Amino acid sequence: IDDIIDQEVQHLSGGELQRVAIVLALGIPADIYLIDEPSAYLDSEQRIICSKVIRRFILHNKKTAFIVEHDFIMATYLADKVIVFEGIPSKNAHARAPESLLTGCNRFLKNLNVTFRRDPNSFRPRINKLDSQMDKEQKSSGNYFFLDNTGI
Amino acid sequence: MGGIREKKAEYFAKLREYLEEYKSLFVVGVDNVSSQQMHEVRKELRGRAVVLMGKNTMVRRAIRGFLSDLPDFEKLLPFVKGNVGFVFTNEPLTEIKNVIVSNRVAAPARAGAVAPEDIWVRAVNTGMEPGKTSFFQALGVPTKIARGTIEIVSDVKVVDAGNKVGQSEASLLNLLNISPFTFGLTVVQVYDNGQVFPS
Amino acid sequence: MKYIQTEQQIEVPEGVTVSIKSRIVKVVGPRGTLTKNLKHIDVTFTKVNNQLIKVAVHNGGRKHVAALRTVKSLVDNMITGVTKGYKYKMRYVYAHFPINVNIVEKDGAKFIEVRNFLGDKKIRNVPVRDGVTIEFSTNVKDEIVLSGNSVEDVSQNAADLQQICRVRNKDIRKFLDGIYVSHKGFITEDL
Amino acid sequence: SGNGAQGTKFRISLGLPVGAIMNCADNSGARNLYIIAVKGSGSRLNRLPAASLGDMVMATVKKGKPELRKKVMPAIVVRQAKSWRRRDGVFLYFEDNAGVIANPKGEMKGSAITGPVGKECADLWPRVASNSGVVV
RNA sequence: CCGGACGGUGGCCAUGGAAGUCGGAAUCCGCUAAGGAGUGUGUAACAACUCACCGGCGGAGUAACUAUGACUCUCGCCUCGUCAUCUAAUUAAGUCAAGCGUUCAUAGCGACAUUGAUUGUUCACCCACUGAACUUAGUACGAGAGGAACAGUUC
Incomplete structure (x- = not known):
């Protein structure tokens, strides 16, 4: 940014501008902070820097934050509750009250119908194909994702 | 440096003859003024006629008075203040004040000192780069960053006459390079010929 | 060497009354009231006049006398705390x-x-x-x-x-x- | 255990005291591993230190490529034989004692592991997971 | 408790640079109440602090190289040996303060002086282990190099 310092914002770049904006919101004190889609224009390292940012400050400062996101992993790290939206795009929509991470994730992922079993090595979501026995078994359990938690 | 006088009654004795030698006797305030400034001020006086010593050894104008017939006792309330001298002179009263009071030596204010007159800070660019602008704001000097420099928004009075200047207030003003008062021998009184003049 | 008496002044101000029996101090003022127990010391408190109270030690050593100022101070800060706070x-x-x-x-x-x-x-x-x-x-x-x-x-x-x-x-x-x-x-x- | 062991380990019956020889179950060139020390083991007069499943030992290679013989290196126990008991209530045992040569951090020297591998070891040493076929 | 702490000048020589403050002696002058050619803190080097001192308040020689010694001349202790080989492994309190400590005597130190193999092995010498691990965290501090803990968890 030292080099960016003199540069104009019109002259600037996309991803660089994004990290700067997220930081700026955090720049000032507020009871509640609101961020909308921080993942845009950012690559892997860049987003994950952001994930650490929101979680750490909020925890520390004891303030609240709402973050909108498309990225699965970013939501998981930062949040404690989730709101899922449904309906049909460009027509109508609906919002829900906040619900626990497990609860909210099942609802959202149920709309998609892709399960992300777990990869034992990576601990990564592993996608599950449609009509299946293993995937079918999960549908009866209610587990879209897995983590270092108890569960079948 | 050793114990030997450090005189008592001896320096008083020189001082005795000094009020009596000269017509005009001044009660004067060094406290504020630096000593290149005092010592220079005194250089002026010294050619004309000279200044001498005391504590309470000064207050003993009474003995001098007792020798002659002039005051006691009788004076209004003995005006002496912290940091007082006596100026014995040929020089008439009115002129002595114009030398001393008009020609004071520059100098900057001080922290915890009572301001003698109104203090203002001007608007314009300080010329200083971004940093702790906040310190200025704390005093009640508005500042904001314009053109990547710290600038003072407006002229305003930081402190009034008769109010003390805060420790933060003083330091920040010195960095600005803003000073402004006149230091010297603050005249606190005159005797001439049976008559008492206050400031 | 034992000092025959040393004493201290505890000045009293307009809004307060302080009352002492045995060595139990009750100071009462605009801000409410404070009481402290001085039995552990051995000093003699004496009223001179609604705005004045003395404390004294007879025939004391260094350490005894040292405790006398600290009694003055202790009761001072009770008085000021009940006024200025x-x-x-x-x-x-x-x-x-x-x-x-x-x-x-x-x-x-x-x-x-x-x-x-x-x-x-x-x-x-x-x-x-x-x-x-x-x-x-x-x-x-x-x-x-x-x-x-x-x-x-x-x-x-x-x-x-x-x-x-x-x-x-x-x-x-x-x-x-x-x-x-x-x-x-x-x-x-x-x- | 120790370095590079991400995870804790629930106690399991000690199978292999110092002096024990296990099969080398990697493709490093080593034929067996002779245990000379267990890491993280404690002290009691007269007690042999003794390893178990997913313990890191210090071994020498008694049988194997000469470039591996005559020296001490880290290994990890992968199969037991002394039966032990899991928290699901089961008493289980392998047919052989066997471990794999490894580095202080916990990286396999070899690239395969031949035979099965108990889960408690797999769970303990990721690069062991990688190279394992049938687990448990 | 606080104000004042000043001119000759940054004394003089040594001086790389030493303007009071590593150093060699010398201690003056004017000032004025009193202000040391300068108590200690000194940026290299002034400052900038301060303080004193006025004040407000049986033994040897020998070398076209070291060593050895063809030659001339004269009457298993040390040892757990060294190299291999077999082992993962192998006997198979305090005072004084001159000094250091680059600047400073005492942070840290202080002269002088003074009040499982191998072995009977003990021992000794290796080979290994480990209060530890995990997150806290590669974080706070740091130009980096590097590097914490309190909380919670498992042994």
């Missing part, structure tokens, strides 16, 4: 981890609750003493303010808080995190 200010200090300080209550409680101290996974609590009130100063950043009639209770309540935030296992000159006492004064202003 006492206000200690403290400020939070941290390099990274913002120290979050609240006031909670479990069972008529009042505690000063310190979260996040250096990231610290433990939640610190210091109980508010009686006779002492706590305001988080508006207009100032991370300043807590303890006030009341008893310098001793304000001062100690203050030190309880600062000491609950000592750092361990770090260079305490680099890791200066804490809540330090920053200003000792009075409740009534101008003075």
Whole structure:
């Protein structure tokens, strides 16, 4: 940014501008902070820097934050509750009250119908194909994702 | 440096003859003024006629008075203040004040000192780069960053006459390079010929 | 060598009456009232006039006499606390981890609750003493303010808080995190 | 255990005291491993230190490529034989004692592991997971 | 408790640079109440602090190289040996303060002086282990190099 310092914002770049904006919101004190889609224009390292940012400050400062996101992993790290939206795009929509991470994730992922079993090595979501026995078994359990938690 | 006088009654004795030698006797305030400034001020006086010593050894104008017939006792309330001298002179009263009071030596204010007159800070660019602008704001000097420099928004009075200047207030003003008062021998009184003049 | 008498003055001001029997002091003024027990010492209090009270020690040693001034002072600060009152200010200090300080209550409680101290996974609590009130100063950043009639209770309540935030296992000159006492004064202003 | 062991390990019956020789079950060139020390083991007069499943030992290679013989290196126990008991209530045992040569951090020297591998070891040493076929 | 702490001048020689403050002696002058050619803190080097001192308040020689010694001349202790080989492994309190500590006597130190193999092995010498691990955290501090803990968890 030292080099960016003199540069104009019109002259600037996309991803660089994004990290700067997220930081700026955090720049000032507020009871509640609101961020909308921080993942845009950012690559892997860049987003994950952001994930650490929101979680750490909020925890520390004891303030609240709402973050909108498309990225699965970013939501998981930062949040404690989730709101899922449904309906049909460009027509109508609906919002829900906040619900626990497990609860909210099942609802959202149920709309998609892709399960992300777990990869034992990576601990990564592993996608599950449609009509299946293993995937079918999960549908009866209610587990879209897995983590270092108890569960079948 | 050793114990030997450090005189008592001896320096008083020189001082005795000094009020009596000269017509005009001044009660004067060094406290504020630096000593290149005092010592220079005194250089002026010294050619004309000279200044001498005391504590309470000064207050003993009474003995001098007792020798002659002039005051006691009788004076209004003995005006002496912290940091007082006596100026014995040929020089008439009115002129002595114009030398001393008009020609004071520059100098900057001080922290915890009572301001003698109104203090203002001007608007314009300080010329200083971004940093702790906040310190200025704390005093009640508005500042904001314009053109990547710290600038003072407006002229305003930081402190009034008769109010003390805060420790933060003083330091920040010195960095600005803003000073402004006149230091010297603050005249606190005159005797001439049976008559008492206050400031 | 034993000094035959040494005495002290405790000056009394317009709004207060102080009453002493055995060596039990009751000072009562505009701000409420304070009482302290001086039996552990051996001095003789004597009234001269509604605005004056003396304390004296007869035939005392160094150490006895030394305790006589400290009696004067002790009863002075009872008198001033009942007039001007006492206000200690403290400020939070941290390099990274913002120290979050609240006031909670479990069972008529009042505690000063310190979260996040250096990231610290433990939640610190210091109980508010009686006779002492706590305001988080508006207009100032991370300043807590303890006030009341008893310098001793304000001062100690203050030190309880600062000491609950000592750092361990770090260079305490680099890791200066804490809540330090920053200003000792009075409740009534101008003075 | 120790370095590079992400995870804790629930106690399991000690199978292999010092002096024990297990099969080398990698493709490193080593034929066996002779246990001379268990890491993280404690002290009691007269007790042999003794390893178990997913313990890191210190071994020498008694049988194997000469470039591996005559020296001490880290290994990890992968199969037991002394029966032990899991928290699901089961008493289980392998047919052989066997471990794999490894580095202090916990990286396999070899690239395969031949035979099965108990889960408690797999769970303990990721690069062991990688190279394992049938687990448990 | 606080104000004042000043001119000759940054004395003089040594001086790389030493303007009071590593150093060699010498201690003056004017000032004025009193202000040391300068107590200690000194940026290299002034400052900038300060303080004193006025004040407000049986033994040897020998060398076209070291060593050895063809030649001339004269009457298993040390040892657990060294190299291999077999082992993962192998006997198979305090005072004084001159000094150091680059600047400083005492942070840290202080002269003088003074009040499982191998073995009977003990021992000794290796080979290994480990209060530890995990997150706290590669964090706070640090130009980096590097590097914490309190909380919670499992042994």
